[PDB]
Amino acid sequence: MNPKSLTRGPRDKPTPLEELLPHAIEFINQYYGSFKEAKIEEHLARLEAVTKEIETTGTYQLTLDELIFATKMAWRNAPRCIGRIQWSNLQVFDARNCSTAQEMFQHICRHILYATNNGNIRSAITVFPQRSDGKHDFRLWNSQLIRYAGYQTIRGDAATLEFTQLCIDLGWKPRYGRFDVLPLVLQADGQDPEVFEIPPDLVLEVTMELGLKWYALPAVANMLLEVGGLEFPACPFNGWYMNVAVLHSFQKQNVTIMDHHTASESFMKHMQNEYVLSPFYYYQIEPWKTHIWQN
Amino acid sequence: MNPKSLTRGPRDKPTPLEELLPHAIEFINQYYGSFKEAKIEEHLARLEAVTKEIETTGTYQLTLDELIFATKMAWRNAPRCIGRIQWSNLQVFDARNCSTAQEMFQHICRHILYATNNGNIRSAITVFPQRSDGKHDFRLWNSQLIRYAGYQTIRGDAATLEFTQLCIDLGWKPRYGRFDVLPLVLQADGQDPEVFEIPPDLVLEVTMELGLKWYALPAVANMLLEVGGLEFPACPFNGWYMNVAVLHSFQKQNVTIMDHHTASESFMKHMQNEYVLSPFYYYQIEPWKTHIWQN
Numbered sequence: 117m118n119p120k121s122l123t124r125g126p127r128d129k130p131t132p133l134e135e136l137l138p139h140a141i142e143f144i145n146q147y148y149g150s151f152k153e154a155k156i157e158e159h160l161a162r163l164e165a166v167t168k169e170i171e172t173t174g175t176y177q178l179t180l181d182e183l184i185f186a187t188k189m190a191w192r193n194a195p196r197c198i199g200r201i202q203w204s205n206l207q208v209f210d211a212r213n214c215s216t217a218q219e220m221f222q223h224i225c226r227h228i229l230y231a232t233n234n235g236n237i238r239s240a241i242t243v244f245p246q247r248s249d250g251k252h253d254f255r256l257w258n259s260q261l262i263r264y265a266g267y268q269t270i271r272g273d274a275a276t277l278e279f280t281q282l283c284i285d286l287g288w289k290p291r292y293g294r295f296d297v298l299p300l301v302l303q304a305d306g307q308d309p310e311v312f313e314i315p316p317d318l319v320l321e322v323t324m325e326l327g328l329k330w331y332a333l334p335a336v337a338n339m340l341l342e343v344g345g346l347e348f349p350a351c352p353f354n355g356w357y358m359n360v361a362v363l364h365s366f367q368k369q370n371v372t373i374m375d376h377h378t379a380s381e382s383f384m385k386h387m388q389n390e391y392v393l394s395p396f397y398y399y400q401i402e403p404w405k406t407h408i409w410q411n
Numbered sequence: 412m413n414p415k416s417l418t419r420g421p422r423d424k425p426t427p428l429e430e431l432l433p434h435a436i437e438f439i440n441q442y443y444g445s446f447k448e449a450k451i452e453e454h455l456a457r458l459e460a461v462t463k464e465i466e467t468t469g470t471y472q473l474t475l476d477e478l479i480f481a482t483k484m485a486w487r488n489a490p491r492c493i494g495r496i497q498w499s500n501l502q503v504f505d506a507r508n509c510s511t512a513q514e515m516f517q518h519i520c521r522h523i524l525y526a527t528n529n530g531n532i533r534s535a536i537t538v539f540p541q542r543s544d545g546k547h548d549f550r551l552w553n554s555q556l557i558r559y560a561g562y563q564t565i566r567g568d569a570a571t572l573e574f575t576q577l578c579i580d581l582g583w584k585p586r587y588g589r590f591d592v593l594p595l596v597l598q599a600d601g602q603d604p605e606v607f608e609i610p611p612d613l614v615l616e617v618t619m620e621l622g623l624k625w626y627a628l629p630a631v632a633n634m635l636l637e638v639g640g641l642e643f644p645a646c647p648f649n650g651w652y653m654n655v656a657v658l659h660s661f662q663k664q665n666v667t668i669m670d671h672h673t674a675s676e677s678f679m680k681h682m683q684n685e686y687v688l689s690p691f692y693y694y695q696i697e698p699w700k701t702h703i704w705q706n
């Protein structure tokens with residue numbers, strides 16, 4: 117075998133124009149090829165502008181349209197994603213102009229709100245600024261936008277035990293329940309991560325005595341979007357969930373799950389929208405294992 | 412004399428609870444003893460939970476913290492290791508949940524990347540699932556993560572002549588250069604080994620006409636970690652290298668070697684982290700000499 121790595125690590129310097137160019141060209145190719153025999157003059161022109169730009173600025177900016185196309189194509193290329201069948205149903209939030217962790221927070225707040233949509237889950241992705249030299253990376257240290265802390269008898273999510281310790285170390289006041297929603301650990305422009313509490317009303321939970329519940333919104337926070345040689349280390353996305361007591365409560369409280377109805381319904385919308393792998397979503401090495409602290 | 416064996420062979424059945432228990436207890440002892448006079452109540456509790464667990468499941472799971480402690484203590488106990496002076500500088504990757512060779516491959520890919528770190532070598536260990544009955548062993552058939560094949564006039568590394576033949580027998584397409592990087596021969600859950608080509612960009616080489624070069628990352632792939640009666644047959648680790656043309660090129664290309672600066676620097680970090688032997692790393696009998704082929 118010769119499988120490729122699903123992880124795309126850090127860089128301490130920009131991509132060689134000699135590496136970036138062939139990649140940029142192939143993306144513009146597949147992007148414009150999507151207009152089958154249409155816009156050949158548009159294609160050629162884009163090729164020149166992009167090339168000139170990489171040659172002068174050392175990099176290039178995708179159009180919003182190329183971005184939206186990349187996010188959807190990268191979703192289609194997600195091997196294990198079951199929801200990719202309806203890849204056209206995706207809302208893209210352009211935060212490529214984001215510059216601070218406070219701004220990141222606000223963008224993430226906007227995504228959670230739109231996406232949650234009172235239980236009627238909508239798929240969305242918020243794309244932050246692309247990696248430049250690798251020394252000014254935007255990153256969400258969390259693995260998911262919404263997740264429960266695991267403390268001590270483990271009091272919480274045993275799966276988040278490491279990250280929870282990290283938050284406490286960053287200053288986060290650890291309560292000790294088993295359903296504590298972890299704050300967002302946001303890194304902007306390569307700085308040290310800032311901790312921000314997620315407004316509690318933004319978090320929709322399905323109430324499964326046991327006193328059990330769970331969050332409604334499944335959002336991956338730590339992947340990297342690669343497109344045309346460009347890399348976006350911060351691009352949180354979400355879908356809706358795919359043991360029967362749960363299946364019943366999600367439905368009872370009207371929070372979207374991938375049941376037969378939703379399967380039929382979303383595919384229908386997807387279909388009614390009809391009228392190495394790249395782009396691709398890569399895993400990353402956990403940021404606390406690679407971060408060089410300023411403070 | 413009465414030296415002990417440095418090899419820890421295979422088992423075809425689980426460890427007797429009567430053998431495992433005294434061992435588990437002594438590890439929890441030294442682990443908790445590390446908090447000198449602190450957490451005696453924590454210690455006692457752990458003892459009960461572990462005992463109960465061995466008695467019910469027939470075995471026990473270390474905490475991530477106990478694992479990290481074991482990996483570092485086993486490094487400290489490595490007699491011939493010169494880098495153990497700075498044993499606190501170790502990154503642990505928990506793959507105890509790994510279940511397939513494809514997953515193993517991905518984990519190994521993640522380690523190589525982190526560890527290599529563009530030449531600025533970082534020490535890491537990736538720990539795979541512990542031996543259960545001995546019939547579902549995870550193993551890396553390679554002796555090192557990165558090594559050159561030796562063919563024929565020997566065309567390569569004479570030291571890897573046997574393993575190279577093995578790879579070819581497993582299906583590997585042998586090129587015939589003297590710097591062919593061998594694929595990874597991964598055994599998951601006791602099955603037959605699967606061959607995976609290491610993504611070439613993951614391999615950093617120091618370019619020593621002669622056309623000589625060498626890989627930057629020295630990683631031991633075939634040792635066994637014993638801790639508290641538990642055994643981990645798959646736990647690849649690495650450090651950085653410790654004839655003058657070489658010393659100069661490693662430095663010139665900024666690939667970490669254990670020179671006076673690195674010696675001062677790493678010890679400093681190690682020190683600034685201050686603010687029979689068990690655990691222990693055992694050698695193993697070469698897996699092709701003991702493997703029972705399914706296919």
Ligand code: HEM
Binds near residue numbers: 241
């Ligand atoms: C709309 C509902 C969706 C459903 C029901 C769905 C379902 C799934 C499932 C079942 C998994 C595997 C879970 C696991 O490994 O435990 C998954 C993984 C994943 N999904 Fe989705 N998903 C949805 C939306 C999205 C969106 C909007 C994107 C991106 C824009 C996306 C990208 C991916 C990625 C990148 C992974 C990992 C793929 C891999 O590693 O092979 N998903 N999804």
Ligand code: HEM
Binds near residue numbers: 486651
């Ligand atoms: C950080 C840099 C490190 C340096 C420079 C270093 C240096 C060495 C040297 C010089 C040897 C002997 C080589 C030989 O026999 O030819 C060695 C062996 C060994 N090292 Fe390291 N090492 C490092 C990191 C590590 C790490 C991270 C671990 C494990 C977590 C480790 C575990 C061992 C083991 C188990 C052996 C064999 C010991 C024995 O059989 O007595 N080393 N190392």
Ligand SMILES: COC(=O)N1CCN(c2ccnc(-n3ccnc3)n2)[C@@H](CC(=O)NCc2ccc3c(c2)OCO3)C1
Binds near residue numbers: 197199260336353354
């Ligand atoms: C090695 O790790 C991984 O490959 N992953 C990717 C899958 N995971 C998650 C977590 C939350 N949301 C999503 N997610 C959302 C849309 N697409 C995927 N994936 C994480 C694992 C996880 O918690 N999965 C539960 C799960 C199952 C089905 C889902 C889901 C989450 O979200 C949508 O459908 C980590």
Ligand SMILES: COC(=O)N1CCN(c2ccnc(-n3ccnc3)n2)[C@@H](CC(=O)NCc2ccc3c(c2)OCO3)C1
Binds near residue numbers: 629630651652
């Ligand atoms: C009987 O065999 C053994 O005891 N061993 C253990 C030492 N060896 C190796 C090989 C690669 N990396 C390491 N290694 C890495 C970190 N610590 C040790 N050891 C192998 C032998 C070897 O190739 N040694 C070269 C060497 C020398 C100094 C090193 C080194 C490798 O790695 C770090 O410092 C096999």
Ligand SMILES: O=S([O-])[O-]
Binds near residue numbers: 204
């Ligand atoms: O948007 S599509 O290709 O059904």
Ligand SMILES: O=S([O-])[O-]
Binds near residue numbers: 499
């Ligand atoms: O981590 S220590 O004991 O210097």
